[PDB]
């Protein structure tokens with residue numbers, strides 16, 4: 001019932017990855033909510049369960065497949081299926097716990113991790129921060145295999161956590177930010193794996209704050225500036241939505257849009 005988007009790391013190109021991310025965004029947003037040229041994800045409040053999730057089916061050169069489940073309200077990876085087993089991160093509330101029972105309903109084995117799925121927890125379990133975890137087609141290929149083999153004991157918990165970190169950034173963060181999609185496109189173009197620079201990390205950490213600042217802005221003007229980092233780690237101040245139009249592709253719903261105001 002939930003829409004499925006397919007991607008494979010096997011012979012992945014800039015174009016095939018671009019098509020994939022475009023398709024993910026298309027299934028995440030309805031077109032009902034666009035503010036300062038930037039689409040907003042569906043509001044969680046009153047969202048029917050039949051419209052709550054999308055599925056990302058990842059295949060690799062090793063002929064293995066995993067299916068990630070993404071929450072449409074924030075592009076969050078809530079869990080995955082590999083063959084006869086499904087695994088979900090610890091839900092942050094009771095409603096979300098009910099929501100995930102609607103995912104992978106025909107699967108033989110259902111597990112909920114005792115840990116939540118945020119970066120901080122995953123980095124703890126991985127024994128590495130995002131800044132030291134390589135991204136690219138190679139890492140993704142390896143991540144798909146690692147997710148696949150977890151249920152049989154082939155994958156240790158640090159490797160699994162690392163693999164989630166790779167998937168989340170190359171799928172969800174790329175969907176959220178054209179800038180991050182661009183950084184992944186470059187890695188694919190040259191088949192060169194590398195850890196994300198400070199511009200990537202600071203964008204990831206600031207997605208909620210940027211979403212709120214844009215949505216609460218006065219005609220696009222921020223009340224408070226947001227500090228980001230450049231590739232070299234130097235500070236970049238954001239005062240306005242304008243500079244973010246080429247950078248951010250999707251926002252999380254934070255508030256209702258203000259009336260148009262007739263002049």
Ligand SMILES: Nc1nc2nc(C(=O)NCC(=O)N[C@@H](Cc3ccccc3)C(=O)N[C@@H](CCCCNC(=O)OCc3ccccc3)C(=O)O)cnc2c(=O)[nH]1
Nearest residue numbers: 074075076077078089090091096117118119172205207208
């Ligand atoms: N698994 C996963 N983990 C992720 N973790 C992060 C992450 O830690 N980001 C660091 C950060 O500073 N996040 C901001 C911005 C942000 C990012 C992503 C989403 C919303 C907001 C924040 O305010 N982050 C919040 C925590 C928001 C957690 C949303 N959780 C969720 O929707 O759970 C759904 C569920 C249902 C069933 C089972 C299991 C999970 C905070 O720090 O207060 C991002 N994306 C993801 C992601 O897409 N998938």
